[model samples]
Target: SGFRKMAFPSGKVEGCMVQVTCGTTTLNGLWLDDVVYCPRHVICTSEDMLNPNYEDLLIRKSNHNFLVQAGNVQLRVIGHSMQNCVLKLKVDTANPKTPKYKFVRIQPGQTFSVLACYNGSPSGVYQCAMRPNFTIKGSFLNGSCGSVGFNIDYDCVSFCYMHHMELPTGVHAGTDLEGNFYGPFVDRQTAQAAGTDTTITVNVLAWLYAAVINGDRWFLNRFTTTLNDFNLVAMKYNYEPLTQDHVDILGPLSAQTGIAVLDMCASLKELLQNGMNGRTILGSALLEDEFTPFDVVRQC
Candidate 1:
C-alpha cells in the first residue's frame, strides 16, 4: 500500500512524512519511498508542528483547592480551532443587542475551556477577569454556535490565589506576592517549610522546547546566553505570550528531534546538541504566519 498524508477529521496535514504510531513496534530504519522512517511515535511533518494544540488551558485543580471563594467564571470552547488557527467566540449574555466577540489564538489541535475566578475588584484576589466586549469584530464560521457560554457567579469573599506548577528535574523557581517573595524550591515540601504556601514548578527544558517551536528567539537568545535556571527569569519573561506568527516552520523539526526531552546541561549544552541532521529550530528564524496557498480563503 502507498503511504498517504495523515488526515484527521479536524484537519489535514500534507508533507513527506506523516507520523504513524504502531504501538511498541520500532520503525527506526524503515523506509517507505522518499520518507525516512522512525518509530518513536513521531510527527515528521511541518504542518502538524506548526499547528500546536492543547485539550484546554485549565490546570484542572480540585474545587476545594482555593483558600478563599472567588467568583466562578466559566469559559468553554464549543468548537475546534483547526485550519483557521484563531479560536473565535460570541459572548452571549441575557440581553444581546450587539454581537460581543472574543478571540483567542490557540495551537492547531488544542481545546479551550476553563472555570476561573473573575477578579473584578482591585484586591487582585484572582488572576482571571471577564471580558464582555469584543476585542476583534468578525463573523462566526469556524467559531462556536454563535453563542459560547461565558458565565460568572460573583461572590463577596476575597481569594488567596495559589499556583502549582511542575518544573523540570533539579530546576527550581520563585514567585512574588504582596511585597513578599517565595520559592526557588524544587518540591512542595520545601516550599511549605519555607512559609511559601504556593508552589510553582516549571519544566525548564519543556519551556525551552515550546519557545523554540513558537519561533521566539528573543527569549531563546536570553536563555542561551545566561544559562540561568527558569526560576531566575520566570517573572521577567512571559513564556506563553503571543508569537510573531501563528505558524512556525521549526515545529516539525522540534517534534522529530524530541528536543523537549533532550539533555543539554553543558555550557547551556551549546544551546542544542541532540543533533537534527543538518537542521536547527532557532527562535532567530521563523516562517511567516500566513494562510497556506490553496483554494479559497473564507471569512466568517
Candidate 2:
C-alpha cells in the first residue's frame, strides 16, 4: 500500500491530510472517521524541528530511516525565558560516598541550557536536576531533570515533572489524595471457583459468543479446552476449533452429541419467530416441547 495526501481549502486557509496504508489484509469495507490538519508551511525548516543554538543536536540517517541523537550531553532546556533556574546532577554509581553535584544561581529570563555527560564508568546512569531561584531553601524541588541509561550512545530528552510529587512533613508518608495507595490485586480472585460460582457466567458466555461471531475458530477451541479443564460448563455449546487430527477422532462423537442440541435450539428459534399460539402435544396437557417446522407451514 502507498501513502495518500489530500488537501482541503477553508476560505483563506488550507490544510492537508496524509495517510499510509501498509498491511497484509485488504480493508475496503471498513469505515474510518478522523480529522487532520496540515503544517503551517509547505517546507519543513530547521526552526520547525529544533533550535539552532544547541549546536550538538544532530540528525543521523540509517538506511531509509532518520534518527535524532543528542550526544553525551544532558539537560538542554530551550525556551525564550525561564525564571529562577537551578541545575542538579545525580550519577548512579556503587559508591554513595561520592558527593552529588548541585548548581544554583541560574540567570532568570534568559535561555540557559546545561550539558552534563557521564564518563562512561561501569554504573553509568546520569540524571540532571533543575530548580528555580525564587523558592525557599530546601524547597528546590521546583524544576526538571534528564536521564541517560547504561550503554546508551546518546542522551534522551529532558524530563521536568519530577517535582510533581507531594512531600510529607513527619510520620505519615504523604497526606495528599493524589498520592494515595490503591488495591494490590484488581480482580481479587485466586481460585477457579471464584469466577465460576459467581455471576461471571455472563462474561464467559459473552466472550464465547464474540469468538464465534468474529469467526475466531482457534480462540474458540482454546477457550473450550480451558473451560473444560477448569470444570466451567456453559448452558449452551456451539462450534469449536479443532485440529485435523483431533477432528478425525472427535468428528463422529460431536455429530452424535452436538447436532441434536443445535437442532433443538434452531426449532425453538423458529417457533419464537412465528409468534407462539395455542399448541398441544400427545399424551400431555402441558404446552408441547414440539412445534411445526416453517417449511411445512403456509402464510395466510
Candidate 3:
C-alpha cells in the first residue's frame, strides 16, 4: 500500500541486483501476492530500470540470497516458484553437531523429504532455500518431542533459490597491487587477463559493515575471525581497512539501493590519475617480494 520498511536476512548486498534462480531460471517477474513471505527479502525486485519496484518495497538488488523454513521435528512443503528452485531441510545428527544445507536447480510443485533423528528430544527445526549460502536456523516453540517428524507448508515461505548471476557488465575503476589502476576491465577475469572481479571484491567488503548495521550479531558472533581474514585479503589489492566513516557515509545509501557495490573509483582514480603514476616503486614492501604487474601471473 505504502513504502514498507523491510529488512535483509543477511547484512550486505553485492550490487543493484542479486540473482534469483529456480534451477537455471532467472526470476523475471511474477506477483505471487507473496504475503507473509515466499519473497526472499534479498531477491531482485525490479525487472529493469524501466520497471522498478515502487520506492515503498523495493529493497536493493541484494547479495544475500536467503533461506526459509521451520518445523518442530519433521518438515513438509510443496515447492512453489515462478520457476524451479530447491527446498532443503538441514538437521543435526549424531554424526556432527551441525550439518549444512544449500541451493541449486529445482522444479515447482515437486515434493521432497527431510529425514528426522536427533541427539535429544526430537524437535522439528527446519528451513529451506534454493540459493547457495542462505543457510537455516532453528526457532524452538513451547516444548519439543522426543522423536518426531513434521509436514511444513511451503507457501508460508517466500525465499526462492536462484543460480545465474549476471556478472558486472562493464568495468569499475580499480588499482594494481601497487596502486596503478585501470578502468572497466572485463567483469570476469581469466588467465592472462585482469577482470572486474576485483571491483566486485571491493563491494563484497561492505558485508562486514553491513552485518554490524543490520545487527546480524550471529554472523559476527561466529565468523569475526573469518571476516577479519577477509579484510587482510582485501589488503593485498589495497582495499584493506574500511573505516566507520565510510560506513556512516555509504551505509544508508547501500540499504536504499539494496546493493553495496562500492565505488572506490573516485579515491583510487584521483590518487592514481593525479600524477602518482611512476612514483618510486623501490624501497617499498609491496613490490620487494612479489612480481611486478608487468611479469606473467604464473609461477616464476
Candidate 4:
C-alpha cells in the first residue's frame, strides 16, 4: 500500500479538547481538539466561540491533492475607429527560424474570439500583424496605412505606442462636409468664408480618441472574470477592481494620439480632394492645347 507511518500518526488523539506539546510545554485548551489519524494531520474545529450563533464546525486538513485539467490562455484587442483590415497571428518559440504556433486570421475592426484550441495550456509570445495586404508605398502614401501596436497585460492594463506619420500636405480635412472643401475655384477671401477647418478637425479627432480608449476600458472592466481571471477555478480571492485613476489616464493619451492620427488623415484627404478638383476645373474650361477655338465654340 502507498500508506505509511507518516500517513497515520500513531500518537494521534480524538476529542473536543486535545493537548498539544511543544518541547516540554504542554499546550492545552485547543479549540478544535478532535483529530483523525491519517497520512496527514487532520483538525476539525468548531467556530462557535468566534460567533455564539455560529453552529458550523470547519475541517482543516491537507490530502494528496492532484489536479489535472487544461490551462487558460486568451488574448483580445480592444479599440475604436479601426478600419476593416486583416491580421495574422504568429508565435515565436525557441527557434526563431521556425515558429511553433499560428492562428486563423483576425479581421479588421473586429475582435478575435477567445481561442480554447490550445487546451488552456498554451504559453508563448503571440504576435499579431494587421493589414497584411498593405504595401510599403501604401503605408507611407499620405499616411493612410498607419497602424498601432500595443500590449495588453494579465491585469487588463494596456500599453501602446502610436506610430506617427507626417501628412503629405499642409491642409487637414475633417469629417464634416463643409470643413473638407474651402478653396480652388474662388479667391482666398471666398475660401475663408467657406468655413474654418480647425474646430471641426479637432472635434472629430477628440471623438475618435475617446471612443477607442473608453471602448477598451469598458471591455476590460466588464469582462474581468472571463478575460482577466488566469485560473479557471473561480474563487473569492480573484475579485480585483480597478481604480478610477487607472481609467482616467486613457482619455488624455487617447485624445492626443487620436488627434495626431486624424490630423494626418485629414491632410491626405485634402490632397486627394484637390487632385480631383483640378481635373474638374480643367475639363470645364476646355483649355487643352489640342482643342481649337472652333471646338470650344461647338461645345457652346
Candidate 5:
C-alpha cells in the first residue's frame, strides 16, 4: 500500500536548525552546526533561545516541506559538523523551458545575507536550497555498520522563501493624498495613521509572520500541528477559538507571532461577530488576503 515510507534507519536527510534572516544590511545567512542542508532539519528551537550550543543541538531526519513568503530572509548558518556546503536562490516561473530561475552558486557559513527590499515578492515560487557538496548517503554506525564518527550528527532546517504585501507599480494609481504611491503592504499601513488599528494590526501580523519568524523555524512540525489545531480548525466556527490549544505551543517567537496571527484572525472573528471593524474589514476587496498566515506560515 501507499502507507509505507522510508527504510530501516531512515535516510540521513535532515533540515538544519540554522537561522535565515534579512534586515536593512545583511542579505541572507544559514548556520547549521555545519554547512548547508539539502533540506535543512526541522527547527524545534534550540536552547539559549536564539543562539545555538551543544546539548541543545538541533536534530535532522524528517521529510516535511514547509512554505514561506518572500517578505525577507535571514542568512546565518553555524555548525561544528566540519563540512562544506553550497547555496543558491531558485525562483519558480512558467518559462516551460526553464520553469525555475536559479541564482549562481555561492559558499556561506557562520553568517551571511542579501536583500530583496527594505520593504519586499510575487506570484512566483522563489526559494533556496543547499546541500553538502560532498555526498552523505546515510552512513552506518560502528564501522561494521559502515560508518563511525564522534562529531557527525546534526539538525538542519530551512524554508521555501517568503513574500509581503508590496505592490511595486502599475498596481496603484497615484499618491494616497500624500503625493507618494504605495502598495498593499505599506499604503495600508499609512492608511492606519488616519484610520483604525485594524489595518496596521493585520499588516503587523503579516510582518512578524512573514518577517520575524522568517528568521526562525526550529519547531515547524510542532508549530504546524498545533497551528492547524487552532486556526485551520477554528475556521469551521468562523474562527471561534474552539480550544485555543495554540497557547501552549506558543514560543517566544511563536507567542509574538501567535499573538499577531491571533490579532489578524481576531479581526475576522470580530467580523463574524458582526462588530464594527469586522463588518468594515469584511467589506474590503482583498479581505481574503488578510486571513491567517501567522498560524499558517505561508511562503511566496
Candidate 6:
C-alpha cells in the first residue's frame, strides 16, 4: 500500500493545529502508537490541558514521514519533546538537480518559521521527519505511554514583504475620474487637485488576480488569502491605500510592467467575492521588504 496520507486543510486565515507522538508498535501482540507518520501540511505540538475546543486537529506518531499541504501560510514550530526534527520542502521542477529543501535541525522549545516564499518558490511539498533514534515515554502515574511529540500552529497572516504594482498611466498622468484606487494621498481634495499622480485606479481585484495569473506567486501566496478575516477586517479598507512615496520610488518601472488590463476581467468577479472586500496590499505600496518571524499560540 501507499504511505499513509495525513491530509488537512489550513484555511484562508485561521490555520490548523497538529500533534505528533513517538511510540512503540507493541510490547506483546498488540499494536501501540509505535507507527510513525509523515503527515502533509502540518507540524506537531506538545500536550497541553486547557479548553479542548480551541485546538483544531491533533495528530500522533514519529518515524513515519508526514506531509503538509501548507496553503498560502507559514508554519511555526512551537512545542516539541526535547528533541530535534527535520523538515523538508520539495519542489516539482523539470529535471531538477535537487528537489527538496531541508531545514536546520530544529529543536524542541525553540521556535522557527517555515515560509511559503522560501527559496523563491511560492508553493511546494512539505514533509516532516523525526530522528530514528529519538523517543520519549510517559510515566505510568500520568496514565500515558512514553512518547515524543511537538505542536505546530499554522495560519494565514498579513506577513511582511514588499510587492510592486504598476499603474497603467504614468504616476504623473494626473487623471482621476471617480472610484479610482489611488495609493496613499492627502485627502480626497488633495488627490483631486493634484491630478498628475503616480497611482491610477483600476479594479483592485482584477489587478491583483492579474498579478497572480501572470506568475506573481509571491503576491498569490502571501497576500491573497482570507482578506476579510478578523485580523484583516481590523486593518480596514483604504480606497487610496498606496503611499505617494512608493509611487515616486517605483514610478519609472510602471511603464515597463505590461500586465493585461482587460483580459479575463469578468471571470474574476465571483472569485473576489469570497472575502476580498476591496483590499489587498497589492493596492497599497508595501510597508517593508523583510520577513517577520512568528510563534504559534492557542486561539478560541
Residue-pair clashes per prediction, in order, are: 12, 3, 19, 5, 54, 34
* Model 1 misplaced stretches (Cα beyond 4 Å): 1-122, 125-202, 216-260, 263-300
Q: Write the per-residue lDDT of candidate 1 for residues 142-234, one digit (tens) a residue.
A: 111111111111221111111122233322122111111123332122332222121111222333444444454333322232224432433
Best by TM-score: 6
lDDT of 6 by residue, 63-85 (tens): 24322223332223233221111
For 1-300, candidate 5 gives per-residue lDDT tens digits of 111111111111111122232121121222222232221112223222233332233233111122212223333222323111112222231112221112222211001111122211111111111111111112111101101111111221112221112222212111111112212122122332211112222322232344334443221222223434445544554332423433332234346555444443443443333433322221232322222222223221
lDDT values for all models: 0.22, 0.19, 0.24, 0.20, 0.24, 0.23
Candidate 2 — which pairs collide?
Answer: 84-132, 84-133, 86-131
The sequence of per-residue lDDT tens digits that candidate 2 reaches over residues 143-227 is: 1111111111122221111111122321101000111111111111122111111112222222222222333322212112332
Quote the lDDT for 290 in model 5: 27
RMSD of 5: 23.1
Higher-lDDT candidate of 2 and 6 = 6
Ranking by lDDT: 3, 5, 6, 1, 4, 2
**Per-model TM against the reference:** 0.18, 0.14, 0.18, 0.15, 0.18, 0.19
Worst 10 residues of 6 by lDDT: 291-300
Cα TM-score of candidate 5: 0.18
Error of 1 at 267 (Å): 7.2
Predictions: Cα RMSD each: 23.7, 27.7, 21.2, 32.1, 23.1, 22.2
Location of the lowest summed lDDT over 10 successive residues in candidate 1 = 291-300
- Residue-level lDDT of model 4, residues 158-197, one tens digit each, is 2121112222233221110111111221111122222221
Error of 4 at 278 (Å): 24
